[PDB]
Amino acid sequence: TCPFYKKIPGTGFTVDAFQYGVVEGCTAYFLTHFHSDHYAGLSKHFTFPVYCSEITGNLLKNKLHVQEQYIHPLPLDTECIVNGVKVVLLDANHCPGAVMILFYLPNGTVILHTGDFRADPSMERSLLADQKVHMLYLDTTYCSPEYTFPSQQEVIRFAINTAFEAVTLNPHALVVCGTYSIGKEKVFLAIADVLGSKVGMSQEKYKTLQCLNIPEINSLITTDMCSSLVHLLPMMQINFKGLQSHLKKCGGKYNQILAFRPTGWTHSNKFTRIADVIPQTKGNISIYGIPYSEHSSYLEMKRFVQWLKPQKIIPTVNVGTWKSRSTMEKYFREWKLEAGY
Ligand code: NI
């Protein structure tokens, strides 16, 4: 049965609620982004209206074979009417095609559902600025002050400089980047660009990337591994055994691997600066864990909420334990008292 925090009151709407069968009284199902915990349940047999971004709708059609007649893509930053309710989709600064949803309820309440997001000051100048929000359904993934990480830009600087140094020192080194879902494409695209290479990957991953409207993509990715010195692999294969095996397969073209695992947060964040990150090494294989996050840090989340001044907050992440719920509720009260709303 669908949890309350996926239901939008005063409407026929649910958000990211595809794994509960037919939800009683749901007339339209919204999907914020194409990550499996959120799309779980969709397939070619789905026959209710799905509302989403253009990019999300490309993925639904091509990867999950959802029939076109039930996909309703909406433009961003545009007031649209769905089953008689005004809605707007806003960029969530998460993975490609990820949105936040503004609902303008018939009785005058305004509700923001962030989906998954990485809050940014740039959001303070979208259509959010123009009216009051009463209820906020918030991505609280990293809602605790221990969760600090660098900007995306510092993390990509570190990766580019690391890769460029290594390959310039040894032109027979291969760079490998791990992936398991869409998101974090900048990691592998920036490394390939500095090295003057295309990124090589499986046919299934190339298919996924071709749905994302990234400019000049035919110029940056390929399925011809032999012509590429930056290879993408499943995140599970980013370990010494899996990488030793891969290196075998390249037929003596390469004699060293430098690999990157983009994680979100890891406890080496509470001690070490990005400048100071070092790899795990075994033989001719090294592995860097880099803290490339597509969710808000604690400080970014705090700033956004203190800007928005919602009357009520509903967390959507970490809701399963009383200890987490109590922690989060204590931070929301602090933020409210400090800012004065
Ligand atoms: Ni996500």
Q: Are strands 256-263 and 71-74 parallel, antiparallel or unpaired?
A: unpaired
318: left (phi over 0), alpha (psi -120 to 50) or beta: left
How much distance in Å is there from the Cα of 115 to the middle of ligand 1? 8
Residues 109, 115: Cα–Cα separation, whole Å:
19
Q: 159, 290 in Cβ contact below 8 A?
A: yes
Question: Domain range spanning residue 26?
Answer: 1-147+296-341
1 and 141 share one domain: yes
Residues 291 and 315 in one domain: no
Are both 160 and 141 inside the same structural domain? no
CA of 65 to the centre of ligand 1 (A): 21
CB 231 within 8 A of CB 174: yes
* Gap between the Cα atoms of 308 and 210, Å rounded: 36
For 3, residues 6+ apart whose C-beta sits below 8 A from its C-beta are 319
Give distance in angstroms: CA of 19 to centre of ligand 1. Answer: 16
Ligand 1 centroid to residue 197 C-alpha, Å: 29
User: Resolution (in Å) of the shown entry?
Assistant: 1.6
The Cα–Cα gap between 333 and 320 comes to 20
Q: Are 185 and 214 in contact (CB under 8 A)?
A: yes
- Same domain for 167 and 248, yes or no, is yes
**Is 160 in the same domain as 216?**
yes
The total number of structural domains in the chain stands at 2
Distance from the alpha carbon of residue 139 to the mean position of ligand 1, in angstroms? 10
Strand, helix or coil for residue 206: helix
Query: What tokens does 296 get?
Result: 């808000």
- CATH number for the domain including 231? 3.40.50.12650
Which residue, among 168, 159, 161, 206, has the nearest Cα to 186 in the 3D structure? 159
Å from CA of 247 to ligand 1 middle:
31
Q: Do 238 and 122 lie in a common domain? A: no
21 CA distance to ligand 1 middle (Å): 21
Q: How far apart are CA 4 and CA 158, in angstroms?
A: 42
* Token code pair at residue 132: 């009051």
Q: Ligand 1 centroid to 184 CA: how many Å?
A: 11
Q: Which of 280, 295, 310 represents a domain boundary (last residue)?
A: 295
Dihedral of CA atoms 246, 185, 101, 8 in degrees, nearest 10, equals: 10
Residue for token digits 């992936």? 179
Query: Does residue 274 share a domain with residue 142?
Result: no
Structure tokens at 1: 């049965």
Residue 299 phi, psi dihedral angles, 5° rounding:
-65, -40
Distance between CA atoms of residues 233 and 259, nearest Å: 10
* CA 33 – ligand 1 centroid, Å: 7
284, 259 contact by CB (below 8 A): no
Asked if 16 and 66 sit in the same domain, the reply is yes
Name the burial class of residue 240, with classes exposed (0-12), middle (13-18) and buried (19+) by CB atoms within 10 angstroms of its CB.
Answer: middle
Are 184 and 90 found together in one domain?
no
Q: Cα(253)–Cα(200) distance, rounded to whole angstroms? A: 15
Task: Say how many C-beta atoms besides its own lie within 10 A of residue 266's C-beta.
Answer: 13
Whole-number Å distance, alpha carbon 302 to ligand 1 midpoint, is 19
165 C-alpha to ligand 1 centroid (Å) = 32
Which SS3 state, helix, strand or coil, does residue 14 take? strand
Quick one: 204 and 260 in the same domain?
A: yes
Experimentally, the structure was elucidated by X-ray
Q: What is the CATH number of the domain that holds 49?
A: 3.60.15.10
25 and 137, same structural domain? yes
Residues 158 and 258 in one domain: yes
Count of other CB atoms within 10 angstroms of residue 177: 27
